Every structure is written in C-alpha cells, then in structure tokens.
Fold this protein.
Amino acid sequence: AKRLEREQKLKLYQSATQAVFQKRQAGELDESVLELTSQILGANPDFATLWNCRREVLQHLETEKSPEESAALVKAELGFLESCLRVNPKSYGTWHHRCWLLSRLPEPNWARELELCARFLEADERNFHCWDYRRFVAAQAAVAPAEELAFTDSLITRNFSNYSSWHYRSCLLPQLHPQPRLPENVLLKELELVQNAFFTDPNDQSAWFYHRWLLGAGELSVEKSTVLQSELESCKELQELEPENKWCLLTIILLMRALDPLLYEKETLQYFSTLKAVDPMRAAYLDDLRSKFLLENSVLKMEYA
Amino acid sequence: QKDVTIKSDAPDTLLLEKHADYIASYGSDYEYCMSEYLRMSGVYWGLTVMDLMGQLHRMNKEEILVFIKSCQHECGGVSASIGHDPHLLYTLSAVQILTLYDSIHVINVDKVVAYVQSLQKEDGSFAGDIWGEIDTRFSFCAVATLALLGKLDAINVEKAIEFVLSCMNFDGGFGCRPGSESHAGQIYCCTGFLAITSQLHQVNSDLLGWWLCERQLPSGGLNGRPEKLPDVCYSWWVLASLKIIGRLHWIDREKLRSFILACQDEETGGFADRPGDMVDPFHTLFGIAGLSLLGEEQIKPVSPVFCMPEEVLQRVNVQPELVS
Ligand SMILES: COc1ccc(S(=O)(=O)N2Cc3cc(C#N)ccc3N(Cc3cncn3C)C[C@H]2Cc2ccccc2)cc1
Ligand SMILES: [Ca+2]
Ligand SMILES: [Zn+2]
C-alpha cells in the first residue's frame, strides 16, 4: 500500500526522466518535455537538470511561437512555479527559475510578485529564499527603502519570528542615510523600537542581537548618555523578573562598556561571574570577552596623564 | 527555546565499524534513485567519511574514476551524474574526490580551470552554472576547486574577495548574496573562501564567533541560525567556521560530542540530522567530521576549510593559514 506504491512512483519518475533525456538528445524541445518535467519537479524540485530542460524548451518555443502563444506559456509557467513553491518553499532551483523567468519578461507584474512574497512570508517569516526574492523584486520595481522599512515594522510588531525582519532593517537603515554608522537621531529611534521588542518578549533573541549592533553603530551626548543609562536600569529590572535570562545580563555588561568602561569595572566583573553561572556553555566565550575588556581597561588606565 | 531532548538511551559511544559498513553498502532504492541529481557529491561524502575512518580501500576507486571522467562535459565542467548538466557544486566534489585518490589528471584540469574562470561575474561573484544563479556558496566552490588544482591565480581574486565581503552582515555573518541573512552553511562557505584567499583579517572574529557559539542549544546540538532546531550537520558548518576564525573553544565540546553520538543509528549505522531520525550519508560525513574537529581519537584530523583529511591536503601542499 504505502511502501508498495512508492515502487510505482519510482518507476514512473524513472520512466519520465528516461523520456526527457531521450527527447533532449534528439533535439525534441517541445511541450511534451514541459509535461514530463512537471510530473517530476513537483516532488523533486532540486533535480536541477530538469529546470535547465524547461528553460531550454521555453527558449526554443519563444522562437517558433506568436507573442500571445509565448505569453500563454509564461503564465502557465508562473502557475506551475507557484504550485511547486507551495509544496517546497525552500528549493533553490524553484526560486531561481522564477527569477530567470521574471528577468526576461517584457512587462512583468512586480506588484503581484511582491504580494506573493508577502503571502509566503505570512506562512514562514524566516524563509530567506523568499526574502531574497522579495529584495530582487523590490530592486526591479525600484521600491524605496522607506516603503520596505514600513513592511518590516508591521512584521516585527504583529508577531515574533523576527530575526529576518531585523536583519532586513539593518540593511535598509544604512540606505536611507548612505555615507561612503547611523545618524544619532535614527539610532535613538531604533534603540527605542528594539527595547520595546525585548521587554515585550525578553526571550526574543533577535532583538538582543540587533541591539548589540546598535550599541556599536554610533563622545556621548546628554540624550544618548541618558537613554543608555535608562536602558541599563530597565535591564536590571528585567534581571529581577527573569534571573535566568542571559541576554539581559550580557546586555547590562555591554551597556556599561558603552557608558564608561573604567567607572563600571567593578560591576562588569560581577556581571561576568553571574552570567557564566547562568550560561555555562558560553563560559569560554565570556572569559575571552572579559579578558578583552580588561586589556582595554589597562590601556585606558595607561592613557592617564 | 526550540530544541530536542536527548532520551536516556541514545547512543553514547562511537560506532565507527557500523558507520563504515553503512557507507560501504550504500547504494547497493527510492532515495538513491531520487537523488541522482547529487550523485557526485554523494560519492564525495561517502569517500571522505570512509577515508576519515581509515576505510577508503573498501570503496571502488577504479569505478569512481571512470564515473568522474564520464561526467566532465566539453565546457570543462563536471555534472552530478552521467547526462546531467555541469555545475560548480559537482566540479568541486569531483576535484575533491580525485584529490583524495591522487588522480587529478583523470579529467582535463585546464578545462576545469577554464570552466570556473568563465562563471565569474563583473562584480566578482560566481554563478553556479550557465543559468546565472549567484551565491557565495559558488565563490567557495570556485576558489576551493582552484586551490586544489594550484590555479587560484586563474580568477579575479580581489573582485571575488570584494563580493564575498559585500555579503557580510550586521551580526558578523555572511549571506548568499548582498543583503541576505546570515546562516551557518553560508558562513562556512565565506570563511572557507576567506581562508583560501588569505583574508581572515577582514572577519570580525569576536562578533562572528559569538553568533556561531550562540548556535549551541541546551541539548548540546547546534542550529544554523537563531530560533531553529539543532541538526548534526551544523557540527560541521558551525565548528569548521569557528576553527577557521580560531574560536572553536567557544562551544561546549562535551555537550556537543554527546549530541553528535546521540544522532547515530545503532542498528543501521550512519548519523541522522537529529536522534531517532533516518540516517543519510550527508549527515554521516558531517557527524564524523564534526567529531574529528573536536579531537576524536579514532578519526583522522580533517581540514576545516576543505572537509577532507588533513593528510591529503598536506600531500598536495594546500593548507590555508587559519586565525588559530
Ligand atoms: C532529505 O531531502 C533532501 C533535501 C535537500 C537535499 S539537497 O538540496 O541535495 N542538499 C544536500 C542534502 C543531502 C542529503 C543526503 N544524503 C540530505 C540532506 C541534504 N540537505 C538538506 C538538509 C540537510 N540538513 C537539513 N536539511 C534540510 C542539504 C541540501 C543543500 C546542500 C547541498 C550540498 C552541501 C550543503 C548543503 C537533499 C535531500
Ligand atoms: Ca577498493
Ligand atoms: Zn542537516
């Protein structure tokens, strides 16, 4: 029944593959190969040579068909690809064939492609193939970073699988303020946004990773000094509420570094001890980080006039 | 949060004899026939894991050499299997195999070089084949293939470097293309690339190293990016990258070792992505290779760059300097 039938699957796939290759050697670049490969590529989208066969067929058919006949084939290809993506949304072959197809169309509908991306990202907000495809589409349609920035906000606040959305922001933000290291006002707004995230969900590692980047991405003004001090106290508050939360402990150390390495030396060293106890797998990392910070402190101490 | 829990009776000993029997017998079948499209890499995974275990002789050298020769196309590129299309992925795998066998001149090396050269773009990137898919995976395949042939000078290295570095991200990692999110497999390809091209000083080793060691979950296993399940093959992608950048000690070796051993199938031999799952040769290689990086006594030292026995690379004088 179950195991018995996949013998029949094999021999059909096998026979269909046989036919495709025989046809290909014969120079038979026609719709029969499209039909044969549709049957195989659905279950086996990583069979790259068959995607190549489809492209060779479509290229050949384009030569001996009317514009409207070629347009029909394209629309059928789009539908085929969408059905394939529903079954396996992470196959490199499928996404690339779609890219190849859209890149050669005279009048592509990019807004429709962006919507396909929105839909696939609703199902899996971490699908990097889809995010990469979206960027491709956004580039071709010349969609502005500001418009994509709005997209990332909705995704971040509506629910929590957010690493991919934060990553995208990290690439968009620099584009809005492109130097040949963010402006402080922009940084300050990002800090507020990410702080909201990791207090809403303190287990959300993506916000903590993105926050570490912001702590490097920009001498303290009174406002930045005050914001950072405020973050410090807020993380101590969280530390009381979630004493096993390692992300907040590490961020406390980093904040003190950002504030005044030498003034906070005592507290930094205490936090290292606590943090290693809470996150013993990272002990070797945390010792190397502490060693680095101590070396920096020695250098700061020696700069004293 | 997302993690596996290792049941109390998971294997906790290394079953090398079982794994060698498993690979020795592989492809004697649904899975096998359905994965013809990767055959050359499958052969690479099997041969390399066997060689790491000291059991290469049990595989069929002569049969594999004839197979490799028949998969080289007129363009110089090598396909996954006979009648499939040439690709950088299978070109690298083929060259890796011939290196293991000291049989590089079984194929036309000048044409392989010409093939690789031809796939570089103006921005320094590489396409996987004539159909133009761009991925830093293919930057790695290009330089690794050329390094093993002594022909790294055949490509535009500075441009290749520039492209890879343009794929570096806020978290210290690397993506497939510029603006693509970091993940462990990609990081391996780009750090491997940077090792081969002598550019490891451009990696933020403390930052990337941190992101990589944070892949280790309470189970001891490694995932490939934040918030995903662990998978034994990350014992390769993560550990190799950490070794390249001199930060292998930043993960817990004993807990990872116990996770990798728990992924073995004590009945069939082989390793699976996670304990109790069905094994495959891919996960068997990376389980064994990960254990070797951790210093497993019964397994040959492995190159973190090439994922081949170090003694093989020593023999051909191709041993990129690491961070330490
Ligand atoms: C099991 O269904 C599949 C799915 C995909 C593929 S694949 O596209 O050809 N390829 C090779 C691969 C080979 C085997 C084996 N034997 C098993 C898996 C696997 N994956 C998938 C995988 C591995 N860990 C988790 N996942 C989901 C990697 C993939 C991409 C890759 C190729 C070469 C080098 C590195 C990575 C093959 C089988
Ligand atoms: Ca033999
Ligand atoms: Zn895996």
Notes: Chain B touches chain A through 46 residues (CB under 8 Å). Chain B has 14 helices and no strands. The two ends of chain B are 32 Å apart (CA to CA).
